[PDB]
Design a protein around this nucleic acid. Structure first.
Length: 214
RNA sequence: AGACCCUGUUGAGCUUGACUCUAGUUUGACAUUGUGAAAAGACAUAGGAGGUGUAGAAUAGGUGGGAGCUUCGGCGCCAGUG
């Protein structure tokens, strides 16, 4: 992995996304990685979160669950909010939980409603992979939502493939290369063998062709 | 101070499935020990093709970006099913 090669791949992906096959929407940029010489079903599953130098997923949507103070804090940043009464109105509906998980890409829950989310909303969010992150009342809800949007997760799944957003097509090439380098460094730090445990790596846009870097 | 008898922590020669060894002999393995093909096996890659226990738009590898794809037929989102 080289910074110049990553910048060249990002420039090629941006040129393909902008000049040849420009889409009808702001296509985001992602990077896909593979694991090797490890057992995703028998060894310990690593996990972690790292905030990139740029916004990884600017098109991601976040839903806030909390009290009236949390709703006011979410409305201060313009994010949608869900009250405790709105959570209890679901009454453990799996279909409603799946619809909420399809509508909202990520969830942030306050400390008061974090324990009551599994009792009211049920395990639908955990089944869909959208478990809400905890949040305190003294922290800034808008800043927490922005940090959650700009950060990515590297938890090991049941398969050897993984991926993470590194920005968008409208972002700068240098910023995209820096985000990709930060994600690669986080993956190398999480891996026990470093680059020996990485199978391959590619970078692309949402609709542009991929470019292999490893 | 012979011969004979008796005794020995007795000495020595000889014999034998007495004990422990051993020459010789026999057998296996490593090294000396290389070169081709042939038949099986294991990996490596250069390609190619597949994913129904089942509800459900489809015969659901899974995963990340994703609301648009675009080869203009419809596929999508959504509904619905998990």
């Amino acid at each position: 992995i080289t910074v110049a090669g990553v910048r060249q791949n990002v420039a090629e992906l941006l040129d393909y996304s902008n000049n040849v096959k420009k889409r009808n929407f702001l296509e985001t940029v992602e990077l896909q990685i593979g694991l090797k010489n490890y057992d995703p079903q028998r060894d310990k599953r690593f996990s972690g979160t790292v905030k990139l130098p740029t916004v990884p997923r600017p098109n991601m949507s976040i839903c806030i669950l909390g009290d009236q103070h949390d709703i006011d804090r979410a409305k201060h940043g313009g994010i949608d909010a869900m009250s405790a009464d709105d959570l209890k109105k679901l009454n453990k509906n799996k279909k409603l939980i799946k619809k909420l998980a399809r509508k909202y890409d990520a969830f942030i829950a306050s400390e008061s409603l974090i324990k009551q989310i599994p009792r009211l909303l049920g395990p639908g969010l955990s089944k869909a992979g959208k478990f809400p992150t905890p949040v305190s009342h003294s922290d800034d809800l808008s800043a927490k939502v922005n940090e959650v949007k700009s950060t990515v997760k590297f938890q090991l799944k049941k398969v050897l493939c993984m991926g993470v957003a590194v920005g968008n097509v409208g972002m700068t090439q240098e910023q995209l290369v820096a985000n990709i380098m930060l994600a690669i460094n986080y993956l190398v730090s999480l891996l026990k063998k470093g680059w020996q445990n990485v199978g391959s790596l590619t970078i692309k846009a949402t609709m542009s062709p991929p470019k292999r870097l490893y």
